[PDB]
Each structure stands twice: as structure tokens, then as C-alpha cells.
């Protein structure tokens, strides 16, 4: 653990991290729906839909072993409410034993198959009721059809949205969660997997939401060491002197103008059995992206959001928690991130500067705000030197993603069809949506520099996400490589908080392939 | 059906060149396993060297001339390399003591040439044809191409060789002298002969669309463009029908009519039909966006980079559909019925223009809140899609320069395709491969649908939040196809060739391959 | 000839003041040797002190009054300095027991006064005339000026003294009381006597142009401006001819007609001619840009700093040509034939406007690709130059508020002149020297001509890359003068006086000096 | 304007002189920047490149 430099004594020297969240104290019980629902304590919510009838009435079909609640849930009473997606009502009443109980529903629309976006709306309606309920137990009755993967996604999203981050602040949480669903026995194994997936996403959210004065290259690498020590992972933090010896000129040039020295995070998980697959996960770790001398001053550049420019690093570290906890077999995974800060100073690198990457390629810097691909270039060279089977990088790389796929779907590029298919498969099972975009080779000529080996950016082509992928491709010589651009999907602007995007996607990729 | 004018000098028709110098080129295909004759004009060998990155040139074909064969010996050819795009010219005398011109074009070191690679090879060939008053060109294929890539070679050669001089008065090229004969030597020649006339048909369909797009908006207006569609249908014996304002008011096409309210040219809906002889097995509707000029309306294109001077190309979708109508009308496929549709109008600023905030009613009854008059393409397409589905077809395919966001997603080379049917999207991709017009599948993300929820109208024309303009626009168009397989091709980024300052005619060959290979 | 209206309150003519109060001023110039009489009104001494930066004022002229001379002794005047622009007033009784007013204006320490310096002293003089109900002003020249600078003093004095009140209703004169007599004392009363009436003619020519420019676009439209040109030609017995749309269509003036397509006012081409009764030795055509309002067209003036509210001045070139027509028609030079031309129109946004990208045909057959509807001045000038050369003249001189880039090259004081003939450029510079309207010679760089190469038309209207717009526009204008000495004066930066919030009438005296001193 | 190419210099080589004949060079024009070069054997059977700008 290095020492975080300060300008004044009031500058923080570490990232506050909450490991034991109230979610971890929630006891989860799964019962089969075919045996009737017991409504005795807490809040009971029914997930109801009406196929065909667009915004049709609510109809409760499950038998409840309570006379007072059964009368409340009679058809004549429930038809006054509709099943429009997200609509909800809950009532407070006394049960047969004169105990205060809360009963209600959440509308699930008229389509039988709920998407991940639909499940988010149902969960958000559920969480709105939890943030206004001092009760000890919540029971969810699934009168809709969801598979094992979507059920786990329901629990993860519930746990994640229920949790409130109060680390920078100067209802009561439930202690029990009951779930009624058909074939309960097959869904029980997803409960503890959802809890692990929850914290990996929430841990990444804590790093992203942490402002740049709390989360800097030194404090972020310290948090990675502390996490690796708690998970018994091998760890190694490369300082400036080691990075200079490795000739990481592109990565070091970005951090020249920062008061925080560059820190390269390298965590490793090795299995006790025969290692059959080697994977390197690379995350972009810009703790703050001012843009450099290409300052983010244009309207819509959103410089106040740029604490999230380490979302890729946070996803890789969040994946390290899930992998270190679930402990897969026959796999060796490397968690890498070239962490630095892009600032304006007398020591910053300039537009037009020509720098040399660790593979010998000279790069002409056309825009200091395209610093992610510069740090990723040296990190990709480091990854391929490890001799792995797959290299997957995740980065808030290009703002053009907001104009291609938007804020819901991330884009994946790569040089290997099999790896892209595995990423797409992991996006389906993790329910973190990703779309495959092409690496158009006709645009490669626009990176031909007049003086350096290659241009950092194109001065003409506006397909920035594809051009950036073409630049990254020049630093992977003979390894299957994929690139996930999460610049559009990392931040949830409606809720004003990060999503932790990529944690579950990367973990499913390690666990399933 | 005849164009209004402001002054008598305003044009009243689009000048269209039907008989191009390409059509006067006599094309002969010979088999290489019989020797190459070097007699007149320029003879070019397409040579490659697999493996050796920029390796030496080696001519492998037998030349039926002792003098020429000696010139083309390996010891003589070793000084030249096969770098993609490189070309050389040779001067020599043949066995008959006649001066001949011989050369080559380098095809790189990869055995399989992409559409971009083949385009670079063709462009090098055209450089040798330009500023040279040759009468004959002979191409010897020492490279490996299938029937589709061979046809693509001819289409691109014909297209790039052709020069549009319809609008040149005092600055016509005094040295423009097209060749009159084209000879091709290739292995297995009998199998490639059927691609020659198909390439010539595909060339003109693309060039015809290029002629309509390149024609400025004072020449190409809704009336003059629909007049050209009638003339084209008459020459091909296609059924045609032009819907005027009175008919359009009665199909209740309020969205389409609102876009053209501010124009001096009345709206004209083009409906061409090709019916097959015999049992019809597939019914297809092709819809093209036909904005002859897009000023943006009261949402005027005044922001930096809006490029209002390019907006004559906003009927590129209509031109692609009309260019496909030529190919279908000429090649005459069987067991297919195709409808060529375009709701043609002009988006202008006037006291009669529709305003931002206006609520209009489409022909299917849906009320639309106009949030941006520059998003007029989806409004005209909405009524055209309702008209198309009413025909009872199996597939509806629309093509449009719809959203400028295509430049930030796929760029200038690949068009985007959206749709509601996996099999139909697969056919479009499948047609993109054989036509060599690249297209990439992009998603219709349903989570963004809520941003089109209007407070007062049934649906919003535009989203006020989501910046994924191509996806939101596809979500809007989807609301006007109720129960038919539908696909949507956004060509706003790929329609114009900025390096050459000319249209591409993009979509003609793709749509034709889709219709022909069904 | 009838001005169309939207409402009955729309004006149908430009109010023009020919009778100025300046014309009612009796001007007498006396020699300094005979002594100065101080009797009525205000007597002002223009004093200088070379070397001495701000040294004391010293009156050197003999004053034919014992009381006044004692007050004006050096010991009394040493308390005042000669800083440029400073002014003082004195009250005294003369020999003759009458109250008189005496003062001075400092003229600095440089012996040769600038045109800007002379304007600064004159402006200080006018401040003494304002808010003072004087009947006579007497100016005593204790400085060294040639005949041209002395005339410039009178022209500038008359111009700045005059106040335009044509559009004041409830906020009018109240206290406006012009002097009725002006006395001037100078060594050589005799050779400066002929400059008095020439200054009065030059003053009104400049003020007449200022009246047309300051007139808003609802008052000064293509119809009302040409009506005023006819009225001016009738008062001066000049030949006049106004070409309407039908005649302009027959002359194939497609570029000029396209600019005015979107206007409610029909295009009007002004053609005035002055011929001398003797043998004509030189024939000259003066062309003025006559855009009564420049909204920019669909390339709307909406960018920051575009200053659309100033664009009533876009006919400043036409106003200067008409103001020159007054001076030439009044002074009646000999052995000269002058044609006064202006292609007048209005650049508006409408369903009938021409669009960006439109290809139009000039009267010389050249097709032009419109890249920006706000570059409309060169389009109207193109047809006007073809018309001018068809008259068979020796010199063609056009003056226009053509390019805003003039503000970044020469600024608000110096106009730029371009041309294809050294002899004509030298004459323009010589007349600029004698008229004291500063002009600087700028180059027509032929290397930029390639940026006007259109892919489809004969020539591009604008360059898409080169930002030297004043030179590129000059390259465009050169393409419409084939075999005649031609010069082009860009007055876009110097036409409007922003400090005084009024036009300058720039170009009237320069063009008149050019015609008279040939 | 953009007239044909005409080589006026005497070339002391029969093969090149034949290439530079007026009938052969008239197929090229003199537009500023336009150029063509051809590869051939001279009288001594040596490879030479000849052209114009
Ligand atoms: C400079 C260039 C090539 C245009 C680029 O893509 N720059 C990157 C970058 O800074 N890389 O280091 C970039 C990354 C994210 C955003 C972004 C994301 C979301 C939001 C909120 O809507 C706002 C802005 C903008 C830009
Ligand atoms: C609503 C919104 C987002 C403004 C829009 O998408 N507008 C449409 C439109 O105006 N009609 O659909 C649009 C279509 C094409 C381009 C475009 C394409 C290529 C180039 C080449 O640089 C330049 C511009 C821009 C805009
Ligand atoms: C092609 C391009 C660059 C648009 C152009 O040159 N436009 C001409 C024009 O409109 N010609 O018709 C233009 C003429 C004058 C001014 C101008 C002059 C002084 C001031 C006072 O600050 C403000 C503006 C601006 C523009
Ligand atoms: Zn950046
Ligand atoms: Zn960044
Ligand atoms: Zn538009
Ligand atoms: Zn459009
Ligand atoms: Zn203008
Ligand atoms: Zn103008």
C-alpha cells in the first residue's frame, strides 16, 4: 500500500468501502407456489400480469392461507387495479391473528416474457415500496413465468437497487425475504449466486461513485490490494519505475500531468486443479478524465461525470470479487488495469506529442482526451505477454456509443468470432445487454500518421467507436481479443448513480466459458 | 404532372442519360487456357503474390506473341511489385511489328479480395483509362474471383469509368473518349459470361439512382421526380400509379402531407409495380424515402456540420428503389410481385409549413406530436408503410437517409438494417454479401420506446432524451407496421461518396439481389 | 413600378431629402492676408504646433479688431494646448461693443493631417455647432492643407453636420437650428474657391447614398429603390432603363434571378447612362451590389455575429453607384460615357427561394453550383458583369459589401480592391488618394481557383475549404469578365459606421474622382 | 486549353523516338499535373521509362 499525496491535510487518503451491507443480513426463503402462500407478517407483493388484455385488471390466482387477506384479494376487489408495467398498490390490514400485514401487487404488463428492462421496472416499483416500509419481511409471489437466469437477475437487481450508498453522507432494512415460485427447488441455487453477483456490482458501484479526490490512482490501487488480500488473490502493483523499465510510454504519458503517480493493478486468480483456460481482463482506469489540454469544455462534454472514467477498472475488480468468492476450477484469470489521471498541468502531455508504446510503436497524439486507448494500448501489450487464451477489455472509451446503441446496450468489438460469441452468450445469461459492432478495416487507413507509426485518433472519420477499436487491435498480435465499450451504459442518469455494468457479464464469461 | 416554376428559367425536368457510353462497349470473354492476344489498345494483367507482402510481379498466362512474351518474362517483371493499387504501363512491339500497350495492376498479397480491395483495384484501372485516348481495354484475370466478385468488378468498372456531364455547359471534358471494346481473359470463362449483361444492368440501375441523387433540388423536385418514375415505368412496361394531393388527402396521409405543406411542389406518391408471369410466390414492397430537398423546416439545418448543401441527397432511398425497379423490369424475375413505393415531397420553410409542436394524424389513426420538423423522413415513411402493408405483401423493406447518427455508429461504408423479423433481416444480410454493398444489423431496443410516449398525442415523433437517433427512429417506424415482416435500412451515412464528391447509388444492387434470390 | 404590399401600412417609396439645410448655407472664403473679421456667430481657429507634442495654441492670423486681438495674445493663449480634438470657447466684446464668440480646435503636432485626423478635428467642430443656436460659423485655417484635403474638410463637415430625421415622428428636431452662413479664411482663398461647390456636390452624393442605405428594407425594396433611381435620373436628365423579370428572363440572367426567387418584390435591374456632348474617349461601367435585404436565404444568418439586423446595408454598393450618378450628372464631365448598373433583388426565405446545392445558369452560359445561399452577392454580380461587358466599355468597376472576411483583413477603415488590370487598379488607388476614401490593393491568388472546380456544374459558387473568402469571391467574379479591364472594391467592412450607428456613403467620392480624373 | 502532347526534342534512340511520335503522344493532354510514363526497351535492349508531365 502506497501513500496517497495530499495538497491540504483535509484531502482524503483512502476510498471508504462498505463490505458488510444490510443486504448480507437478509435471510432468503424460497417456497413452491403450488402449496399456497402464507401471509402472516411483513409485506406481501404479487407479481401479476394479464396476457392479451392490454392494461387488463389484476387477478390473484394463488390461495392464501388467511381469511382476511383472501377476502382482500378477491376478484371484485382486485379488478379495480390494472396490470400496467410498473403500477403498484399495497394496503395495510389485520390478518386472522390480528397482526398488521401489508399486501399488494406489482403490474407486469401483458407480455408473458419479461425482458431485463421489464424486470428492472418491476423491481424499481418494489424498491419504492421498500424505501417506505419499516416492516421486517418482504414476500414476493411470482404469478408470472421467469427462467432461472431472470430470477437471479430479479434478486440481484432487487439487492442492488434496495441498497443505498451513504458513505459520503454525514425505513429499516428487511431481515427476511420470502419468494413463492413454481419449481422452487430449481431456483434455490440461484439465491446465493445472486448475493455474490450483487456485491460485485455494488463494489464496482462504490468505486465509480467515489469522487476523484477519494478515488485516485494511489487510493484505487490500495483498494485493489485490500480486496485481493481479503480474497486470497495474488496481487502486484507496478509503480512508475517498473513501468518505465517496461517502456510503457503511452500509458505513462497520460498520467504525466497528474499529482498522483500511475499505478498498474495486476490481480491473479489461479485454480487448484489443472489450468485449462487462461484469461486476461483489462479495465480502463482513468480516475478522472478532464481531457487534458483538450479540455472537456464543449457543451454536453459533462466534465462533472468524469469520475466514472474508471468504470472499466471497477467492473474488472468487481469481477475479481465474484471469481474469488465462487472459486471456479481449471481457470487462471488476470485482472489488469493501467490506472492514472488525465489532468491539465505544466507536466501534461500535449496534442501533437509523439510517444512510444511498450511494443515499440510510435503514436501521434491528436487529442489528449482520447487517453483511454493510450493506457489500454500498453495494458494490452502487458496482457498478451502473459500468454493467455482470451483478452477481454472493458472501457468507457467513446462518447459516440450514446449515438449508436444508447444507454442500455454496450458494444463489443473483437478479432475473434468465437470470443465475441462467448461474450454475447455471457450477455444473455447475465442479462447485461451487449451488441456486436464491426471493426471496419476500410477505416484503418485513417490512422496512418505522416510521422509516427500510427495515429491515436482520426481527424476525419466520425465512427469513433470503430476507429478506437482499430487502434486497440494494433496492440494484440496473436491472441483472441474482445473490447467492450461501456461509455454510454455505465452511468444511470435517471437515478444519478452508477450501474456497475460489466461485473456480472465478465463473471459469467469466466464461469461458463 | 408538370412542374411549377418561379421564373421561366426554372427547369421542368430531370436530365437523364439512358444510353451511356458504357452501353456502347462491346464485351468479349475468352478462356485463359487458350492464350491472350495483344493487338490493340491497353492490356492489363490483374496479378497478385500470395504470402510475399509486396512480392514481385509474375505473369503466368500464355501470350500468343513471341515479342510480348519475351517482354513479360519473369526476369523483366521482377522489378515490379504487386502492392494493392499499384500499376505500371509498358510499351513494346508485337510479332506484327505493331506498337502495343501492356501493363498490370497490383492486387496485394491476400488471395480473397474484399469489396474494398476490389474497389481499389478498379480505381487503379480507371486511372489508366483516364487521360488516355484508348479504343480497347483488355483485362486478364490472374487472380481468383467467384461469379459475384467478377460481376462486382464489372459494375464498379462501369460505374467509376462513367462521367456525369449533364450539368456541364462551358466546362465539358474536351478529351473525353470512352473505349469501345472490353476483352476479358479468365479461367473457366463459360461460367462468367452470364455475369456480363447482369453487371451492365446492375451498373445502370446504380448509375440511374446516382443520376437522380446528383441532380440538384431545383431540377429534381417531387413533380419532376415522379414524372421520371412514370417515364421509367413506361419504358419497362411496369404498372404505375402516381397519387396526387386529392388521393393522398383521401388516404388520410396526414403525416406525409404535413411534411410537404411548406413546399411549392405538390406531394407525389410513386407506386410502381412489377408482376410476374405465372403463379406469384412472393409479394414484396420496397419503400424509399423521397425528400427532394431537406432544409429541415422551421428546425432549420443551421447548426455547424448540418451540411444543408448536401440535402439534395435526401431522396437517395427513392432513387435506390427506382434503380431496383429498372433492374427488376429488365431482368424480369419470376414468381414475384414487387411494389416500388416512395412518398415524395420537399421540406421547406414557409408560412404554410408545419410547425414544431404540431399534432398530426397518420393514415392508421395514430396521432403524432411533432417535436422536430427536421425528423420529417420518419413521418413520410410512416404513411408509406401503412400504404405498403395495405397491399398485403410478405415483406416490407424501406431504405432511407434517415438519421445522421449513422456516421457515429457504422460510418460511411456500412449501412444499418433494423427490423421486426429475423428471417427477413437474414435475407437482407445475405443479399448484402452477394451484392457487395455492406450492411450491418443494429438492434431495435424496446427499452427506449417509453421516450416516445407523448403527453397529448398517441406517440411522439422524436425522443427528447435518448440520443440513439437511429434506434429511436426505428422504434417510430415499427408502430406503423402491424402484422408484416418489415426491415429498415438507414443509408444516411453511406449514400454520399465524399472523396469523389458524387453519390454511390447505394442499395440498388442490394435490393435487386434480395428480390432475385428470394 | 408599383411596390407590392402585405398590409396597407407598408410603405411604397423611399423618403429622400434632396433639399438639405446644408444647401441653404452661404459659403464665403476669404484670404488670410486681408485680416479676419469677428462680427457675428462663432469664429474657430484651426491651430497646430509642430514638434511640440501638446504645446500651446498660438493664433498667427491678423484680426481686424483691436479688442479681439488683445484677448488672442500669446500670453492669454498659452494656457491652452493643441492636442488633436480639443476645443475651447471664448466670450468677448469686440471694438464695436458687440458680443462675439471665438474658439479653437487643436490639430495635433503633425504637419500633414490624416483623413482620419481631419475627421477627428471636424467631429470636434460639429460638437460646437450642436446644442448651439448659431447663425454663422467662421473657420480660420492656421494649418496647411492642399485643395483635396480642404474639400474633404468641407464634405466631412457637411456630412456629419447633417442629421437624418426622415423616420422620426414624435422624437424630432425640437432645437435643430442650422447655421445659415459659413466663412473660411485661408491663404489662397483663390484656388480653394473652386473646391466649395465641388464639396457641396460630393457631400450630397455621399449623403444621398447614406439615405438609401439607412432606409430600412421595408422602405427600400427592389421596386422602391429602382423607382428612386428613375426619379434621380429624371432630375439629372440622365438616360434610364429599368429591366423587369420578363426582360431579365430573355437575357438568361439565371444567377441574378435565382437570388430573388424567394422575394415578394420582383427583380429590377437599374441602368443609368451619362454621355457627354463631345467626343467620348473613355467608356466606363460602374456596377453596384443591390441586395435590399440579405437574410442569407436557407443559409440563414443565424450564427453569432452574423448581424442580420444590419443587412439593410447590403445595397451600399448600389447606393454608392447612384450617389456617383448624382455627382457625375451634376458636374457634367466631358469626353466620358458612364453606365450605372445594379442588379437589385432581395434574399429571403420562402417556398420559392433557391436552395443550397441548386445548379443555375448565368447569362454567359456558365453553370454554377450554389454551395451557400448567403453568397448571393457574387451571383447577382455575375450577371451584372456579363451585362456590363456586353456594353463594350473600357473599364468595369464593381463595388459591393461582398465578404465579411474584409473585417479580418483591412478592418472598418480601408476598403479592398481586386482586379485583373494594373492600370485600372492604379487609377482606383489614385482616385482613392484624391477622394480621401482609403482603399488597399489585395491579390487575386490563382492557386485558390482550383477550389471552385465543381464536380457537376461549370464552376462552384463558393470554396468549401479555403477561408480567404474575399479572394475566392474575386476569383468567382473574374470568371464573368472575359476581355475587359475590371476592378472590384469590397466595402463590406467600411460601409457602416458602428461608432455613429449610421452609414458612411463609402465609394461615392472615390468613383466620382475616378471618372473625373481619367 | 488541355491540348495534346507534342515532344519537340530530338531523342538519340530509335525505340524512344518511335514512342515519342506525334501520333502516339497526341493521345495524352497537357493539363497541369497530368502525367504518364511507360516502360520499354531502348536500342540497346535496356529497360527505360519515358514519360511527360
Ligand atoms: C474525444 C472523442 C473521440 C470524441 C471521445 O470519444 N472521447 C471519450 C474519452 O474521453 N476517452 O478517454 C469520451 C468518453 C465518454 C464521453 C461521454 C459519455 C457519456 C456522457 C453522458 O451522456 C458524456 C460524455 C465523451 C467522450
Ligand atoms: C433528428 C435528427 C437527429 C436531427 C436527424 O437525424 N435529422 C436527419 C434529417 O434531417 N432528416 O431525416 C438527418 C439526416 C442526415 C444527416 C446527415 C447525414 C450525413 C451527413 C454527412 O456529413 C450530414 C448529415 C443529418 C440529419
Ligand atoms: C460566404 C460568407 C462567408 C457567408 C460571406 O462572405 N457572406 C457575405 C454575404 O452575405 N454576401 O452576400 C457577408 C458579407 C458581409 C458580412 C458582414 C459584414 C460586416 C459585419 C459587421 O460586423 C457583419 C457581417 C458577413 C457576410
Ligand atoms: Zn478522455
Ligand atoms: Zn476517458
Ligand atoms: Zn430532416
Ligand atoms: Zn430528411
Ligand atoms: Zn449574403
Ligand atoms: Zn450580401
Numbering used by the authors:
A (entry chain D): 85 to 254, 261 to 603
B (entry chain C), C (entry chain B): 86 to 603
D (entry chain E): 138 to 190
Paper text:
To confirm the binding mode and suggest a reason for such excellent selectivity, we solved the 2.5 Å X-ray crystal structure of PfA-M17 bound to 3. The inhibitor binding modes were well conserved across all active sites and subsequently from here on in the molecular interactions of 3 with the active site is described only for Chain A. Analysis of the X-ray crystal structure of PfA-M17 bound to 3 showed that the position and orientation of the compound was similar to our previous inhibitors with the hydroxamic acid core coordinating to the zinc ions in the active site. The two zinc ions are coordinated by the hydroxamic oxygens, that also form hydrogen bonds with the conserved carbonate ion and catalytic residue Lys386. In the S1 pocket, the tert-butyl makes no interactions with the body of the protein, but the amide carbonyl of 3 forms a hydrogen bond with the main chain amide of Gly489 as well as a water molecule. The 4-hydroxymethylphenyl group that replaced the trifluorophenyl group present in 6 f packed with the hydrophobic residues Leu487, Gly489, Leu492 Met396, Phe583, and Ala577 and the hydroxyl group of 3 can interact with the sulfur atom of Met392. The inhibitor 3 takes advantage of this specificity with a biphenyl ring system bound in the S1 pocket satisfying the hydrophobic preferences of PfA-M17 but with an addition of a hydroxymethyl group to allow the inhibitor to reach beyond the S1 pocket and pick up an interaction with the S-atom of Met392. The inhibitory activity toward purified, recombinant PfA-M17 shows 3 to be a potent inhibitor (Ki = 18 ± 3 nM) with excellent selectivity over PfA-M1 (Ki = 4424 ± 501 nM), which often shows cross-reactivity with PfA-M17 substrates and inhibitors. In order to reduce polarity and improve water solubility, compound 3 was targeted. This compound possesses a 4-hydroxymethylphenyl group in place of the 3,4,5-trifluorophenyl group present in 6 l which reduced the cLogP from 3.6 to 2.5. Overall, using this unbiased thermal stabilization proteomics approach, we have shown that compound 3 is selectively targeting PfA-M17. We also found that loss of PfA-M17, either by knockdown or treatment with 3, resulted in multiple hemozoin fragments that were representative of multiple digestive vacuoles within trophozoite stage parasites.
